[PDB]
Amino acid sequence: RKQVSDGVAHIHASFNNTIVTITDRQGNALGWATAGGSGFRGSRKSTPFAAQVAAERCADAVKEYGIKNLEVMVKGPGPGRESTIRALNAAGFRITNITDVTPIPHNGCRPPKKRRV
């Protein structure tokens, strides 16, 4: 409801979903839409088209906060980073920088065993 006019969009790009959330520069969130919550499931739940649909649905819920300046931070090399980026770029937003911030450990924990498929 207020005016910040300079926010940041976290894009959790999972291999099964894509979570876009715009937040105040100090981590306080404003709104969010998901590729799942945009009426998609199964395969389509993780397709770039559904990713851009979710990006636009989330943009349509923060426009009343009055922002068109964004930095975006992407996490997870899932399909649906390119899509949401170009979507929120085609939503009248000005993106100053895009940043890969996926959490990479320095050999922290043992990962789950590989799937035998």
Partner RNA sequence: CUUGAGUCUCGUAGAGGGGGGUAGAAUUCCAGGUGUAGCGGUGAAAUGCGUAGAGAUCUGGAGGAAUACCGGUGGCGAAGGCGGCCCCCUGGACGAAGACUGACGCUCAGGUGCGAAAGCGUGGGGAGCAAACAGGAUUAGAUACCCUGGUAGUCCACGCCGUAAACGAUGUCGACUUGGAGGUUGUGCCCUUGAGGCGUGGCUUCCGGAGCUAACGCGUUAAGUCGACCGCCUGGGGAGUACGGCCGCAAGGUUAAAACUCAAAUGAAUUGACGGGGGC
Closest by Cα among 77, 46, 59, 47 to 20 = 59
Q: Which residue, 3 or 107, is less far from RNA as judged by CB?
A: 107
Count of CB atoms within 10 A of residue 39's CB? 12
11 bridge partner residues = 20, 74
3-class secondary-structure state, position 113: coil
The angle formed by the CA atoms of residues 28, 57 and 4, to the nearest 5 degrees, is 35
Stretch that binds RNA, among 83-91, 92-100, 107-115 (CB under 7 A): 107-115
Q: In whole angstroms, how close is the CB of 83 to another protein at the nearest point?
A: 8
Q: In whole angstroms, how close is the CB of 58 to RNA at the nearest point?
A: 9
97 binds RNA (CB under 7 A): no
CB 48 within 8 A of CB 79: yes
From 3, 92, 97, 104, residue interacting with RNA (rule: CB under 7 A): 104
Residue 75 binding: pick among RNA, another protein, none (C-beta 5-8 Å cut-off by kind) = RNA
Interface residues toward RNA, by CB under 7 A: 10, 12, 14-17, 19, 21, 23-24, 26-32, 34-37, 41-43, 45-46, 73, 75, 103-113, 115-117
